[PDB]
Each structure stands twice: as structure tokens, then as C-alpha cells.
Amino acid sequence: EKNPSLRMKWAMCSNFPLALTKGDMANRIPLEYKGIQLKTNQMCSIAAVTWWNTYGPIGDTEGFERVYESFFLRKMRLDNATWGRITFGPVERVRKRVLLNPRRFLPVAGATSAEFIEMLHCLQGENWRQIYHPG
Amino acid sequence: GIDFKLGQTISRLRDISVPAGFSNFEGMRSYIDNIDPKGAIERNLARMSPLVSVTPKKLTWEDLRPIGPHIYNHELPEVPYNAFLLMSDELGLANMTEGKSKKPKTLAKECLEKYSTLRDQTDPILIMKSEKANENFLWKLWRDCVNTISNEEMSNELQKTNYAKWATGDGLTYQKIMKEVAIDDETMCQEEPKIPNKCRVAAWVQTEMNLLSTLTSKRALDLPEIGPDVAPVEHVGSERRKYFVNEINYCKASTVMMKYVLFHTSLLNESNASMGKYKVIPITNRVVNEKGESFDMLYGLAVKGQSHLRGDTDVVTVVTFEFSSTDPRVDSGKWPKYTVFRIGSLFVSGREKSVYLYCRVNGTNKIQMKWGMEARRCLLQSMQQMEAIVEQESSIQGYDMTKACFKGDRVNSPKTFSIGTQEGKLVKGSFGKALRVIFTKCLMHYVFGNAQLEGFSAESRRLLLLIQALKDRKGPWVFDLEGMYSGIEECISNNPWVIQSAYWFNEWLGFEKEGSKV
Amino acid sequence: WRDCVNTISNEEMSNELQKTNYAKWATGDGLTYQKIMKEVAIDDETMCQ
Amino acid sequence: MNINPYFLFIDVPIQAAISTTFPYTGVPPYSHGTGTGYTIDTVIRTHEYSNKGKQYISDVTGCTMVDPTNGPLPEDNEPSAYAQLDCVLEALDRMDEEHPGLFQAASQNAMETLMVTTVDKLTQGRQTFDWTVCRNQPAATALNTTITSFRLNDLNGADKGGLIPFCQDIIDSLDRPEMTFFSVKNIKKIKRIPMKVKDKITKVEYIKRALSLNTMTKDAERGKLKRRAIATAGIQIRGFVLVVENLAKNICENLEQSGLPVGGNEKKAKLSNAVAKMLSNCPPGGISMTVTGDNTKWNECLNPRIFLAMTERITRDSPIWFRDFCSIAPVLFSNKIARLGKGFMITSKTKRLKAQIPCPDLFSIPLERYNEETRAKLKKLKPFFNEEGTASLSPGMMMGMFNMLSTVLGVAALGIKNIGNKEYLWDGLQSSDDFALFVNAKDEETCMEGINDFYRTCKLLGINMSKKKSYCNETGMFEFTSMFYRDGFVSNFAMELPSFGVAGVNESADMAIGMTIIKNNMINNGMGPATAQTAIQLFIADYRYTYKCHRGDSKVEGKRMKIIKELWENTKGRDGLLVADGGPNIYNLRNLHIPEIVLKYNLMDPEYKGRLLHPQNPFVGIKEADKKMDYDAVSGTHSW
Amino acid sequence: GKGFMITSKTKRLKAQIPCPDLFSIPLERYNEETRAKLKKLKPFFNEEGTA
Fold this sequence. Notes:
Chain A is of the alpha+beta class. In chain A, 32% of the residues lie in helices and 23% in strands. In chain A, the strands form four sheets. A three-stranded antiparallel β-sheet of chain A has the order 1-5-4. Chain A has a two-stranded antiparallel sheet with strand order 2-3.
């Protein structure tokens, strides 16, 4: 099909649209859960996924943060940041090559460090301006 | 190094693919590499005939003339109603519900159960059949939907499946034969194209514009929540949103838009699930009034017949039976495509009112169903405007003008815009009325959209920008004007919105002319 | 007729038309009405005698 | 009281409200039925603008060719393809003089990229015409099929790495007396099964197949009452085309007038810079006028022969091997062949019969059995018709084939800047077939002469501008690349915001890809906060419906909904639940750049996070989502 | 017998009408001769389809 969304809409309602791997971890999912056919004897149903996050073994998560420091760094930069007032007057933005994350030509009126660019969407505006300080 | 040798065939093509005056590529290559031109353009321009030129003419208010004068001709027929579903004449059987989401088949059965007089009506009182619609076919098909919807089974498949093959006109399809027979057969010839009829303005298009931009007691637009707002930008964005939704939630256009989206969604789900079978697809909606009570509204049933075609542009017959309370005899010229029966009556508020049933055989493709699901972006289109309008005001004065624009403040009167006319006198209206008019205008672009509306809107844009230049005294010039008008006018054939839009453009142009004179 | 002559003059003893599709329209076998059930005929108004 | 929506323009500029004037909420007008007719008008129209050239018979293919280049100068205002070679070279010479060393720098840079380029690059693109099956197949599928068939004919070089040997054999393949390849044969076994078969064709047949362009109808096109034809070429011309487009792109990138390579939010800057510069250069007391331009039949009047000249001029100082390589694509376009649709439909109403006459058998039926428009179309098509169902299309171009090169030609006409040393100076912007022209002169009358001189000057280069679609006014308000400028305010309101729906890959990803598009729209298209906020709401509604993951407090019934509701009650911390797991949506404007998995890590309960983030879970294009766009996502059970 | 047969040539459609339904159709659709025949047979026509 030439539209991924519609192909996905039709795929979602199918009985078993998910492809399941073979292993012991794949055998701990019940064949049927209160009527719903989670799997077949491999093909998988989205209900089987929902069961996994609901009932199943609690896997350990110790190196997840270390693997994903960049994203968690973004989250804490947002959380620890502070917000000022908002200026509604016209703004003058100078086109510059800026770095999105810690490159593209964007209109920026103020700090051009990657910390501000990552949030630029919520700071600049045609007829408004906001003061932001990354954490 | 690199030795990119050329073959015998490629070289021969290169030799013969040279501009006139060169025998081979080598002659062309040498000429470009050595000969230098130092005024070839000037020589040619002098040598060129003077008959070719932009022939520019200054544009003046007198130069501009009404677009499509033929829409005022009274000999042409009134442009008929050709939208997929009734918009302002719609009637929806309301069934108060706690709020639980149920399958459309169960919703239809309960709504029809509440109105047993209409469900059980077996004797049809034909009011008018369009030109060729079979009253017996349409009614027998309709009773099939009611029986199938009200049966105890959980499937919406029509129970006949053989009467429907001919009631829907599916069986009256030409049979394909091998090419050789057709080449031999002398009576087989290509058909002429179906030229669209030229029509004149209709008073029903204006009425829909008037009625569908008004506020109603029912709001059908419910949207998902978003995360908490911790920044001033989020708060002002929420404040602007709250003002926008509050003014568009209860407009009749919003309820109409959701009904179109839900129906085309159900149509597309059935289209993939069902290929060579006939199904009844309730025309339903979910509404909530001011008090917060939720109702299930049934606007009719539709027979989505067969399909048997995978692709983008492949007609799927759809026969729609839609409830309504408007007498087709009041405006005969508006319903020359609908076979409408009088099926009963009801007391909306203690006053008796007839309930007609508009029947019609239609067709649709997969893309139209897909883009029907995508009629909610009219919400995005309508809003992007007031954001700009409110933003422009905020630039003039610091503090947010959302409250001032919509309701006013200490130092600014509420904003007003010209919305319409009465007795030839321009009328003003609040920002809410303009917002609803903008939303309704966007919706009609989707509902009445086709190749004619794309051409008119794109071609008329040039005239609109010319008028803007005239207003600013920029002294616009047009190299030709009749050609520009002809391109715009060629798209005014039978589309209700385009014909009405032409009438509105002429009306606005005259007002601009009078304003210019002063 | 040309198919007839070719079939007659063909090496195979079979005496059946080798086209089987052109003759269907040459003889007009396909130019026949399609029978429907009585109910539709009753309902339809253009189905006369 | 009758509501007139146009009255909103009385109290607002048309540019500000221009968005509502565009019907982008409706169905894009699609093509219904055969596109064979439309392709025929393109051929008739293309030759109608070049019938005054020289008509001869191509010896390589036997087709009837038409060459309007260097032909008689136009006598009327109809479109004309009679571009004068000397004038084109003069414009290029002026172009090179204004940017010394640009042609050399682009040629050297293009070559360096060509040397490093590999065959895998050709797999990037759109549907391509596969000569083996005479159909349309993806670039990767066509490239493999061509590679395998070249092996059969002993043509090697594809395996050799670099694109040069692969492109070398393609030329060599044009000389083989016969070509052997794998063909899909549908044998009836009742069942029909397609198999491979070793098919062989003659040299002339392969030549035609290599030069052929499959033709369909331009579907989903917005803003036109009538459809057109969109063509795609085969693999034989792809590789050569990529290099030439690279060559044109390098030149265009260094041009101030050019706006085609520029993309994103830089378009508004380009519009502002050009108008500011022209106003400053305006003479004291003079008048600066701007022409909102538009070219009609832009592709049907451009000649591949001219592009061959431009490639020669651009590569003036380069090795002959590269000059030959850069001159191949124009050569394969001057001798192109247009495959015509899929035939016509002829019906008998009395017999209730219909049949499809294929293109090879178009003239096997008397013309009296076609309607008037088709009858006239076929009468004019006969001279250029081939017995195999194709039509020779030597003159003109096909839209989208040479876009960068076409812009270079357009910019060259803008660089003339004057004619006859008259008292005016013109400049403008160019992007493919769209242009805007600014003229500065002491008075309006002299400005019109400059526009008229520009109109005539363009006619000499094969560039036709539509008088019907073009208008002029004082500088400060104009339109370019479908963007409206007025008194320093740009109102780009023609791009359609993409349907804010799931990208249809998976749960965690789609949430990441979705939230990325809204953020980009804020940054690039100036999407406001409120409209950005609502775009989030609409997507979430779509996201929950498609994925059957509504809020746990919702009364939706479904297979996964029952499990979602069970999880909602079981989980102590609801705020940590993912949206796909029936969790609340916490996305807002400030947080459109963090994956939801990372967002809810702190709020996620220890059990839920362990289950979702099990290192070895049974359920587990990550970089780019199929145009390639990057999205930030976290691996997890939802990444099935 | 087995009843008359009614056909439309504009749609290549035909259908035999069983005798019990002889009078279920407007007589204006039978041929004039059968029209008169039925207009004269109506008095003695049994509901089941017998005379």
C-alpha cells in the first residue's frame, strides 16, 4: 500500500498482526487470556503485548539509563529549567547555523547554544517571546 | 585512470541529437567551445517581430468585471444539491445514553427502537422520485436495512443480497469482451465525455452558509487532553484554545463535520473487511449538549454495496437513506437527485413535524473515504487564522488581546468584522461569528471539493491578489485580463460552492468598488 | 468461415472449432437476455411484455 | 442577513486570510479511468510548439524527430520552443562572468562525487520503468533485474563497485545484437502462476526499451481543473541523470536568484533579501515594480538539445571522459519515447458491452468510432505513432526530470539585467517553473518596457511565461514559490500540514515520529502555539483509535481494551503509564522533544518499567521512517 | 400453464411471471391482447392462480 497509516489501521484490527520470536520467553505468554487469543501455534496479537506489560516477569533495569544518557540528559535539562515572563512585542530573529541537540539554519533571537535550540519551538514566535534558562 | 569509452549506438544518437545547423556532435562541441556570442540576444530581439509582447495594460476598478455572468441567467437550471449527506436539512434521532461506547449496529437498533413508529412504517408515501430512481427498489432496499439492523444477529450484512444486486444498480454493468471481437464489432464506439451542465445560483447554498455558521445547543467536538501547562506560552496557548473551541464547539458545522468523518471512517473499515457483499452502515454521531448529557444520534442508514475493486479510484456503490424534516416540495430544484418518502412524524417539542426519508444512489472511492476521515483538519485550518489575527493584535499592544479580541477590555472594544449584508447594507459581527463563518467555509471546501473547486479557488486567487494591489494603490498591471477571467470562469459549471462563491465574489467586488469611490 | 476452412484443412482429425470464442459472438450466443427472479420484475416498471 | 465569506477581506488583507482561500481540506482531485488520453495531449501539445522546426527520421530507432532549436523566431504570443543556441550560450557566458570559476568548481566537485559514487546509490529514488518486464517497479527491484540480465549477456561492471563501470556497460549493452533477460511469464495451470523465462529481444527493441518513459496521470495534484501526465524513466538513464542533476545543483547552490535547492524556512529569508536588495538599488525617484510570474508549458517547451549545450558549456574545462558522461542524459532525452497510457474504452450501449483497445491497436479501429476530441487527438498523433503502442517525443521535456538544470537556464535569463542598454534593471528569483521578477526604472512606462523586453528575451531561450497567470504591481507585494509577501510580511500558507496520524510502524515509534512533525511545524512553518497544541490533540485521538489504546477510565470495549483497563486498576502510578498502554497523555509544547518512555521513567512503577523494559523480551528502519526522516525512540516491548 | 413472460430490452432483462401473480402487475404492462384476456378473466380468477 502507498499509505503506512491506513495499512497500519487495517493491520491493527487483524487477529495476529505481530511477528513473534521463538524462545522460552515467548512460551510464557498464555495461549488465550479470558477469551482473547493472544498467540497461535509464530504469530502474535497486540493483546499479547498488553498482557506483557500487565502480567509477566519483572525484568531488571540497571544499564538502561547508561545506554540512554542522552535522552535522560534532555529530560533533566527540561525539568531543572526555569521559565520567565512572556513578551508579546515583535521580535527580530537573525538567521544562523545552530546545533539542534548537544546543524540547520534557523531564525534565533537570543542565546544560540544547543540547549536553547532544542527548545526553540517553545521560545521564539512571530509576535511573542519567552525567556528560558536550561537546567 | 578512468576510460569512459562511448559505444557505436550511443555515439550515433549523440550525433543526431544536435541543434539545427550542426552535422554531428563534434561540430557542436567545437562551436560551443570556441565561438563566443557578444549580443546574439540583441540581434534576435531586433530581428524578432514586434507582434509578440506582454501588451500590458494598467488595471483599474472599471477593468474588473463580475466573474461568470452566466450564473445570473434564469434559463439555466438551479444548481442541485449533490453533497454526500444532508448538512442543514439533516435530522438525527437522539437517544440519551450514559456514555458507554457501543458498536454502530447496536446504536442504530436502540435509536430505531425508541422511534418505533418510523421503524415499523411499512407503507411508503412517495413524495418525489428524481428522474429514474425506482421507488420499489429504493424502499425495498431501505426496509432491508431496517430489518437487518433490527435483527438479533450481530452481522450487518443485508439479508437479501440478490434483490440488492439490482436495487443498487450493480447488476446493470457492461460486460467486458476480448479486444478482437470489439475491433470486429463496428457498432462499438467510444462514448462522448459527460460535459457538466451549466447552472445558475441557488438560494439553498446561501441558506446552508447562513444556517451552518450559527451556534446550536449541541456540541459534537470532543478532543483528547494534553499535559499540564507550566509555561506562560502554554497558558496563553490554552487560553486561545479555550476561546476558540468554546465558539466553534456548538456551531452546527462542527456537528456536521464529525458526522462526515465518522461515516467515511465506517465506510473504509467495511470496504477492506467486506469486498463482495452488501452491508448496512449507520450514519451515527456522538453529541453532548450544554448540560453534559450525551446522546447517540442516528441520521440514517447506508447500503455500501460490493466493491470487488482494489485501488484508489474504484467506485463503491453507496445508497444513502437519510432522515429529514424539510419538505422537498418547498425547493423542488434542490433535490432532483433524491427520492424522498414520507415515513412518519414526531413531536420535537410538543409540535408535530413531518419526517421524510431522502434516498439516493451514490458512489465513492477509497481515497474519498480516506480523505473523509481527514475532514477534522478543517479545525486546524480554521484556527490557524485567528492565531494570526490574535497574534497581530498582540504585536500592536503587549498584553494578550485574546480576551480583548473576543469580549473586549478596558482599553479596546471587542473586534468586529464585516460578515454579510441585508437590504444592500453591509453588516458587522463579532469575532465569534467570523470564526464560525471561517470554519464553515473550510468545511464546504471539503464537502464540495472536486476538480472544479480546485481550479476556481486557485485561479480566483490571482484576481483576489490583484484587488489587494488595487486597494493599496500599488498600480497593478495585467498583461491580459480576459484570459485570466476565462480560466476562472471555465470552472463554474455545476459545483454549488463555486457558483455561490462566484456570486459572493461579485457582491464583495461591488462593495469594494463603492468603498474605493469614496 | 476462415476458421471453418482452417479447421477442415488442419492435420488433426478433430472437427471442432479451434477458436471457441470468436464464434460465440459470430453466432450471437452471447446476445441473450439474463433471467431474473419474479419479484424484481414485479417491482420494476420498464419490464413489459 | 446573508453571510458573505469574502467580506472578511474588507477588514483583512487577502494575504493574511489567503490560507482560507486554499481548499486543502478536501479530496485532491484524482484521475479516474485511462490516462492514455492525457498523455496524447502532451505529445500533441509538445509537437504543436515545435512543428516549425526540422522534421527528420531517426536512423537509430526510425522515429519521426522534431528539432525546434535554432528554428524560426516566434511570430505570435503562443508558446514557442524555438530557442536560439547563440542566445542560450550568451546567457551562460554572462552567467559565468558574474560568478567566475563557478562552472569549473561545480564540474570538479560533481566529478569527485561521481568517482566515489557506487551502484547502491541508484537504489534511492521512486518507481522506475523496468525494461525486462515493461512495467513499473521500485528502483532496487529494477536495478537488481537489470544487473542480473547484464550478467546473462556477459555485461559486467556492476559488481566492480564504482558507478563508472556500471554506466559503461549500459552503453555497451546498447550495441549487443540481441539482449537476453529474465521475464515474468504468466502461465495458466485453474490457476495463473508467474515464472521466470529466458527471453530474447533484438537490438532495436532494446534501444526503444532503454529510451522509453512510462506515463501515468498526475494524481493527488492540487490546484488545477484538468489532470496531466507524469513520466518515470528506466534504469538506463537514471545513473547519468543523477550526475547531471548534481552538476546543476552545485551551480544553483551558489546563485542568489536560485531558490530551488533552498528548502525549509530559508525561503522566507530569500524573499525578504531579494526585495530588500532591489529596493535599495532602486534609483532615487524611480519606480520598482515586481512581476508575479508563472510559466505555462514550461516542460513542453524546454529542449533536451539545449540542455546538451548547457552541459557542454558548464564542463568547458574538463576531461573529455567526464564531458561525455555529463552529455549522455540529454542525449537519451532528445531521443526519448513516450509509452502511452493503457489504451481506450469502447462500448456498445444496445448490446451492453465494453472493451479495452490497447495502445498498439489504437489505429486498427476506424477513427469514426472515437469521440470528437479523441478523433482529433489520434489524427494529429498518427505521424509520431509507433506500431508498438508508443509515440516519439523528441522536443520538450517531462516534468521533474531536469529540475536543477531548468532553474539554471531560468536564472541565466534573469542575469541579462538589461536589453539595448535601456533605462531599466531587472532581477528576480527562479525555482523550477516558478519565477518572480523585479524591475527598477524611472517610471512605470519604462518598467513595462523592461518586462516586455524580459518577455521577449525569455522567448529566445525557450522559456514561456503565462500572461494569463502573470500580473505586475509596485514592489513590496508579490508571490513566489506559492508564498505571499506583503510589506515585509511573508504568509506561507499553501503547504498542507501532513495528516497528524500514526506513521504506521509501531506504538513507541509512531508516538516519537508524530510528536516530531508538530515540533518541526512550529520551528519551520511558523505554526502557532494553540494550533500546535490542537495538532497534538488531533494526533492523540487518531493514535488511540488506530492502536486501540484509550485511557483506562474510558468505556471503550475491545480485546486490548480489557487488558488496558486491568492494567489501569493494577498499576498504582497511573501517570507513569505509556499512552499506548492506556496511560495519560502528558505531551505539551515544552516537551515535544523527549520520548514518552524516558518522560515517564521516574513516574513509572518498578513493576511496569521492568515488564516494559525487560532486557530479553519476546517482541523484540529504527533510524529513518519510510523521504527519510529521523525520529528519537527507545527500544522496548512496543517496538515489535 | 406457467404464466406470461415480461422483458425489458433496454436492460436485456427477462422474467417469467407465475400465474398466481397474474394480477400483481398493472395490466398496462401486458400486451394489449393479454390485457383484454386478463380483464375478461378477472371475475373467475382464483386467488391461488386457477380459473
